[PDB]
Design a protein around this ligand. Sequence first.
Ligand SMILES: CCCCCCCCCCCCCCCCCC(=O)OC[C@H](COP(=O)([O-])OCC(O)COP(=O)([O-])OC[C@@H](COC(=O)CCCCCCCCCCCCCCCCC)OC(=O)CCCCCCCCCCCCCCCCC)OC(=O)CCCCCCCCCCCCCCCCC
Ligand SMILES: CCCCCCCCCCCCCCCCCC(=O)OC[C@H](COP(=O)([O-])OC[C@H](O)COP(=O)([O-])OC[C@H](COC(=O)CCCCCCCCCCCCCCCCC)OC(=O)CCCCCCCCCCCCCCCCC)OC(=O)CCCCCCCCCCCCCCCCC
Ligand SMILES: CCCCCCCCCCCCCCCCCC(=O)OC[C@H](COP(=O)([O-])OCC[N+](C)(C)C)OC(=O)CCCCCCCCCCCCCCCCC
Ligand SMILES: CCCCCCCCCCCCCCCCCC(=O)OC[C@H](COP(=O)([O-])OCC[N+](C)(C)C)OC(=O)CCCCCCCCCCCCCCCCC
Ligand SMILES: CCCCCCCCCCCCCCCCCC(=O)OC[C@H](COP(=O)([O-])OCC[N+](C)(C)C)OC(=O)CCCCCCCCCCCCCCCCC
Lengths: 50, 331, 65, 63, 171, 31, 459, 100, 120
Amino acid sequence: RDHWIHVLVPVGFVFGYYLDRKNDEKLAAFRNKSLLYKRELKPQEEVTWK
Amino acid sequence: MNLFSSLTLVTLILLTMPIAAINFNTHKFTNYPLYVKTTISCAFITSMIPTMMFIHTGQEMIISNWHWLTIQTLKLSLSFKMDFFSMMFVPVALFVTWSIMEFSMWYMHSDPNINQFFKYLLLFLITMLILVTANNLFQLFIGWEGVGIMSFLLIGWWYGRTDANTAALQAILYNRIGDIGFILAMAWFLINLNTWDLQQIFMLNPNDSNLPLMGLILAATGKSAQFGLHPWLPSAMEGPTPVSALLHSSTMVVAGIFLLIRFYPLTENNKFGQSIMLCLGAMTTLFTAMCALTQNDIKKIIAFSTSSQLGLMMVTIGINQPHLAFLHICT
Amino acid sequence: LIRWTCARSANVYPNFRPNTKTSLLGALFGIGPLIFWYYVFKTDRDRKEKLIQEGKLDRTFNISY
Amino acid sequence: DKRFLKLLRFYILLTGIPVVIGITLINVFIGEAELAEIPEGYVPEHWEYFKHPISRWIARTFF
Amino acid sequence: SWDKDVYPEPPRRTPAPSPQTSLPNPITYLTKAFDLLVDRPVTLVREFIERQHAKNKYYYYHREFRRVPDITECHEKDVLCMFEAEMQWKRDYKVDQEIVNIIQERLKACQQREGESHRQNCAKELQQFTQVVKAYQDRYHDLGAHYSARKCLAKQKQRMLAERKATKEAA
Amino acid sequence: ITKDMLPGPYPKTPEERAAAAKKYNMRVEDY
Amino acid sequence: MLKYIIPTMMLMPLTWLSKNSMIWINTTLHSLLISLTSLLLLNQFGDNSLNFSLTFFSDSLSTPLLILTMWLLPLMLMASQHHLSKENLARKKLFISMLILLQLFLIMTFTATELIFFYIMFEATLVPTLIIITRWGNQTERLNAGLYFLFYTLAGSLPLLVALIYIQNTMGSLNFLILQYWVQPMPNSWSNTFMWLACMMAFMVKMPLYGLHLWLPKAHVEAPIAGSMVLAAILLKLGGYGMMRITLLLNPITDFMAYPFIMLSLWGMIMTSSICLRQTDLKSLIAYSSVSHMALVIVAILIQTPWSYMGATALMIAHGLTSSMLFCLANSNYERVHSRTMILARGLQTLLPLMAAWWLLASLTNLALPPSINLIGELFVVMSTFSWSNITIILMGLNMVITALYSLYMLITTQRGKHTHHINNILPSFTRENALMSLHMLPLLLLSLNPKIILGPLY
Amino acid sequence: LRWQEDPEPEDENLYEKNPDSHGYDKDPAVDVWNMRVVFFFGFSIVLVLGSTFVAYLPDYRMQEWARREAERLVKYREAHGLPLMESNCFDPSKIQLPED
Amino acid sequence: MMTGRQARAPLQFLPDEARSLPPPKLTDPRLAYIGFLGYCSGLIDNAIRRRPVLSAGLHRQFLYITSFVFVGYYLLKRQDYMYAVRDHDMFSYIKSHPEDFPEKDKKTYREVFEEFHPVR
Ligand SMILES: CCCCCCCCCCCCCCCCCC(=O)OC[C@H](COP(=O)([O-])OCC(O)COP(=O)([O-])OC[C@@H](COC(=O)CCCCCCCCCCCCCCCCC)OC(=O)CCCCCCCCCCCCCCCCC)OC(=O)CCCCCCCCCCCCCCCCC
Ligand SMILES: CCCCCCCCCCCCCCCCCC(=O)OC[C@H](COP(=O)([O-])OC[C@H](O)COP(=O)([O-])OC[C@H](COC(=O)CCCCCCCCCCCCCCCCC)OC(=O)CCCCCCCCCCCCCCCCC)OC(=O)CCCCCCCCCCCCCCCCC
Ligand SMILES: CCCCCCCCCCCCCCCCCC(=O)OC[C@H](COP(=O)([O-])OCC[N+](C)(C)C)OC(=O)CCCCCCCCCCCCCCCCC
Ligand SMILES: CCCCCCCCCCCCCCCCCC(=O)OC[C@H](COP(=O)([O-])OCC[N+](C)(C)C)OC(=O)CCCCCCCCCCCCCCCCC
Ligand SMILES: CCCCCCCCCCCCCCCCCC(=O)OC[C@H](COP(=O)([O-])OCC[N+](C)(C)C)OC(=O)CCCCCCCCCCCCCCCCC
């Protein structure tokens, strides 16, 4: 690629964004378990947030 | 209702349109002063319709059109008070400004920065009508500091001259000394009444109104050049004659008088504030008229004349006649 | 001009000598106003707090602070 | 100074005019939403609690 | 529009125009010119845009937070429950702030609308304003910039001890 | 600019006073 | 926050692998892309902060500081590429790497959920700043100024280390989210007195406190332009951010420990503003104005009311933009006359009219002209200090006179009067310079349209 | 005399060799592309789309909701005769007091 | 502190019960940071001998990365083992001494009285 250097910061964004989403699944202890937001699962659904 | 408020806001937006025209320029204008003068002629004609239908019924209103900022219990909205004071002072200021700018198309004809001059003079007019159409103390403070800064930029027009820069910084200095008391007033009204709006100030109607009215008197002493804070208005004759003619005779210098006229429900129940206003206005109208008797610069004589008449306005506020004082402004 | 600015900024401390006049002026204009405004603001706030906890100060429509 | 102000106005308007036109097209043709009561058993998404289409797009896309 | 009971307006009573003079007022001519040149084209453009709205109609909702247990029935230093209690309290604090804003809007609208007899004709709005400001001041004043449900509970307990001691020493 | 054209300490000896007066470009009688 | 940490780290291979004519343009482009992405932090809620992970979170206090931090890097690159044009290529890349490393320390300073990680990043911000001042400063005094900047900060902050580890042992944690809910009242004692001092004096040095401010008119004067921008726009705000985090733990003792410091600030903003009336060095005039403006943020944090915190965060963001623009304007003259003396080059509106308009707008925002967010923060601190004591308005209002007086005198000396005859190298304003002025001023004026995003956690 | 030193270089004028210089670089193509990058990715991208983003934030710190929710509660208790705000934030039934 | 625990089996880098613990992953961020330290060591080794920093000695840079990842994997195993031993001894001591670790009654804030300090 003639402009390989102009993807170092955006891919480093996306990967970083990716890792943030990947951290959220480690902090999913109280997903659909808080007293404010707990509810019954709608059909064709397995988690409330991802 | 739909005609009154429409032409009310059309006057102000019509004044702001040549600022967008001068800021979005590429060419040399085909007589931008004629464009701004036509704009202010049409703004005068436009503002005469809500004035006529206030003479008809007495129709006052408030346009709190844009919710700007809620500091937890203080809802600052873009709020325009169309009462007797706005309905009379806006067409008088537009008519006077239209005459001043047709004068300025001749007096400033050799100036290569005439478009900047008409830009600054229109910005002064915009900030002054922000001042007199304001409904809360924040927007009135915007118009207040706006006419102070356009006073700075129009006194120090010939900025290579040392004395113009000196007189402009002098005028800013005395106005900020008045702004100490104005911000004292805003502070008192927020802390004791949870408002800067005029309606809640007038409806709650406090009896311990010594301190905020002293702050408003200090603000008017700064702005209208009463005694103690007077010499910047003779010093302000260093700017061009349309600057000394629009700003420093008729329009900006009455804003302190207009500020005390605007708070007439508080001054009508404070005899101590009326006494302070009466004494300060009489002191000013004596002292400046006495100083006028021996001057030889003609603009200084007319500046002491208009400060003497502002002292007379402060006198007739101090005898609990705010509407005669506002009639004397418009006169 | 360079000599003027170097005198006004950089030559001040290397030609300072602590003595009677400089100590009295540096303690008179340095901590004098600090003591003054401390006692004024402390007196005003003690008076205000003593009025407030007795129910004397009109704090009726005061809900912004 | 004139070259700077020409370039400043050009590079502001370069995306400013399409955004003003797009916001006009969204307000006319897509349009501002209408406040409804939540149905029984229906769980709204978090972007379905906002009124303007661009705000719904932000709350759905990024937040 | 809005809800006419939370923002109440009295009935408008305008007088019939009874002209005594023989000269025509320009205001009726300008009213007809504003109706023709301005009000009808603005109305047509708004009806066009509103038809475009009705071609695709979709809905947004008011978010409903169910009540969680408050700070009183949360154990000491139990962050999972007192966090929920604190979020409940902060939402209630923001809503009480906007209730005060509603009553201030009522008072200012009453003062302008009544005009010159505002001191007599706005006594009920002034009374509701004084009550809601006394309630807000007893509830949230002097907590500080680091306010919490614990701060408000401590202020409430101090106020209740003061009221209990004042009641008991008067009996 | 160099160090002996910058301001220095208080002159006491008369040659130091004359060197200061030469530095500030003024007469010794006026320094 | 890892979506902002990793692009800031990828700016390091972006600046070390670029072609020699390309190392400014690529870093400017991608730092502007990071600053465009910085608006995703505005997902703020009325009740909860935006809590990303165990390590990182952001409320509405840190969010404007983060957007300002990520916005200041492209502006520093624009400001610092002219005077480093003749520089060696590897030293130029090391300069850009120091600015990138400083931004990388700052964005996880403001988002540190735990207070000792806040301390580690907060003191990691010394090393790029110290290296930038003592390596790419212009004059001789940069070594001494780097020593003062280093050893006021560390002498204030090494007690803060002991204090934070003491809170760590006592409470069990230094999570700010835990310490919101486990905070105990700090009773009156001498132990808690020196506890309060150890928590607060590092941030008093960082603000700066009057009396501790002596590092600042050296470190902000002996630095290059990017160093002055990051010092006066971000690094003075680490102190206010740290105080707004740390006064949670210091109640109710702060309610009487603040009384001397408030005096030191309320009198200090009278003195330092007055110092700006008689300064010959324009960069030092902007430095003492920075001390004067940050004294209000010290008072607003120490009176700890909601209006005071709102005004203090508004005044910090506004002063960041304003003082950074003023330093850039002083550099725009210093690149032409090669002297920071303010009386040297006068009457510059006769030669640079659009740049004189930028001077005018920066001086009007300096004097807190409404409705700029400068005035919003100024006015809200004035409201809250009037509620604190009704006399303080005097010391406020007199300050608001002198704040006008140096802001226009700086305008009158530099831009007005008759120009200096012997100076003839006054070039027309480059497009880079006016671009830098507009990227300072146009965000500052657009924030007047929507100020609620810079009003902090308790809007 | 003093040591072997390069003399003081002159300050350069970017307008002499390039009258259309934007101040970024002495290579004119590099200079103009630096100008275009700064003006596009600074003004066209961050300022315009950033002000569009800030202008259309999804109810920033839920103020609008808190108006509408308040418009519920007053409307609930204008009707029932309930006071518009209690002075006690928490129910006094669920508060134990320290007796004396 | 734990000098008596690792004295019955002396000089064991990883004891047998360390095999009961899950090993660090090969995608451990700590292990990837140690690999980055190896890469920086390779770059400094090219810089101090005035080689082309990124290009010269890719076998040498790869052995730097390999050696730091290899040593750091065992160092992380020992780290995880020692914190596991720390928590194990903590919990066995808490279980073996209930007279020193009472179960404290968690009072709710309706009973807990705190002094209010007003900010005014
Ligand atoms: C045109 C070019 C303009 C400039 C372009 C370039 C600008 C520069 C670049 C800008 C880049 C973007 C920057 C960010 C902006 C983002 C947008 C944003 O924030 O929007 C906010 C805000 C909300 O927009 P929204 O959320 O999308 O819509 C909310 C609605 O609920 C939902 O929307 P809705 O569906 O209800 O709205 C409908 C609306 C669509 O809405 C929009 O388009 C709004 C979006 C416009 C945004 C513009 C922003 C740019 C800046 C404007 C201001 C500066 C302009 C230049 C200077 C002017 C002078 C100062 O429909 C129309 O526009 C049609 C109506 C046309 C009326 C006039 C003609 C009627 C008669 C015609 C007769 C002939 C035909 C008959 C037959 C017809 C048959 C079909 O939009 C505005 O504020 C719009 C601007 C105008 C406001 C009112 C103006 C008057 C106010 C007067 C009183 C107050 C001032 C007093 C001052 C006193 C003196 C001191
Ligand atoms: C969300 C969309 C928003 C859209 C609307 C935009 C909102 C405001 C943004 C900023 C607007 C001003 C920008 C221009 C000033 C800087 C450059 C300059 O001097 O150019 C002169 C130049 C014309 O002069 P020239 O003859 O060619 O050469 C200059 C001369 O050499 C020498 O020049 P000079 O000395 O003869 O002339 C300078 C003169 C000097 O005049 C003064 O210094 C007097 C100003 C103070 C007193 C009057 C104002 C007081 C406050 C009241 C107004 C605000 C509230 C009004 C509402 C009612 C009351 C609440 O100033 C002006 O003419 C500017 C008028 C406006 C001043 C604003 C206040 C600045 C004072 C300090 C802060 C105070 C609070 C600010 C609050 C802002 C609220 C938005 O103008 C241009 O070339 C304009 C370029 C394009 C400007 C784009 C502006 C928007 C950029 C934002 C981009 C991203 C968003 C997309 C929206 C795009 C919209 C198009
Ligand atoms: C040439 C350009 C003009 C537009 C051309 C194209 C459109 C043609 C004509 C149609 C008009 C546009 C569509 C309708 C307009 C938008 C209607 C609407 O609901 O807009 C949403 C709102 C209306 O207000 P709101 O109350 O609904 O929303 C505010 C947002 N909350 C509630 C969250 C706080 O915004 C606007 O309309 C913005 C217009 C602002 C105009 C005045 C700006 C003054 C700038 C001063 C800044 C500082 C002030 C400080 C002091 C304040 C007082 C103390
Ligand atoms: C900017 C330069 C100046 C910086 C000033 C920094 C703050 C000024 C005061 C610092 C004192 C030292 C740190 C205190 C940490 C307190 C933590 C704590 O647990 O406190 C409670 C503890 C109390 O002990 P305890 O908590 O373990 O006791 C158990 C609890 N009771 C009391 C009930 C039994 O305080 C101390 O142990 C001592 C505190 C004072 C220490 C005095 C020694 C230092 C001397 C002054 C140094 C000043 C700065 C030096 C640099 C100057 C420039 C070069
Ligand atoms: C943020 C912290 C860091 C600071 C530095 C950040 C720099 C990086 C840049 C990031 C992106 C930009 C950030 C700031 C964005 C602020 C702008 C913004 O979003 O505004 C939102 C505000 C939102 O106002 P609003 O709240 O009423 O909007 C209603 C909400 N919606 C739209 C959803 C219905 O936008 C406006 O007000 C736009 C109104 C129309 C345009 C302006 C018209 C008036 C202009 C003046 C006219 C003349 C008047 C008289 C004066 C005459 C001359 C003196």
